[PDB]
Design a protein around this ligand. Structure first.
Ligand code: CL
Ligand code: CL
Ligand code: CL
Ligand code: CL
Lengths: 100, 100
């Protein structure tokens, strides 16, 4: 569901993603997602406009906007958070990536 | 470069992609891309708004908008075409995917 945050069931670079596909856009068996990376190590100067900072599980995370990818529904795990309250910064970051 | 079409150097689901990242958005070593699939078999009723039909190498191709992904520059092959003349339908398809 748009702006809900889930765990990957499968091993990869990242452990969380935010679903960014519209809820009225039907892709049977897949969703378009932006992975989240722990900010803990991630460099502070990195653009917050292109890479928003979000708060999940009492820690800071970077939205890895430029690692956006489709995930099959088979690998979508537990829903862990909702980022709909960050819709503005998510929209701004995606629109910057394509249209600057 | 935004809206240029390239071959993948590596085997995968698709053989071509269109670069859709802004030219003023710097992701060292990667670009955001939408793969192209031969329309030849692809079903005619499929939304042309979400999945535009483009013409390359004297054949029709479907822009697989919902398979958008980052590709490392190491796997970017020859530039084969330019789709900047389809910027309007590409923009419309991406904006529909996220914002309907
Ligand atoms: Cl991480
Ligand atoms: Cl937040
Ligand atoms: Cl194909
Ligand atoms: Cl065309």
């Amino acid at each position: 569901m748009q702006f809900k945050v889930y765990t990957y069931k499968r091993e990869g670079r990242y452990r969380l993603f935010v679903d960014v596909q519209s809820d009225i856009i039907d892709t049977p068996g897949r969703r378009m997602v932006i992975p989240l990376a722990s900010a803990r190590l991630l460099s502070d100067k990195v653009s917050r406009e292109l890479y928003p900072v979000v708060h999940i599980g009492d820690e800071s995370w970077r939205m890895m906007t430029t690692d956006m990818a489709s995930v099959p529904v088979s690998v979508i795990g537990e829903e862990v958070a909702d980022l709909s309250h960050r819709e503005n910064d998510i929209k701004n970051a995606i629109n910057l990536m394509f249209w600057g």
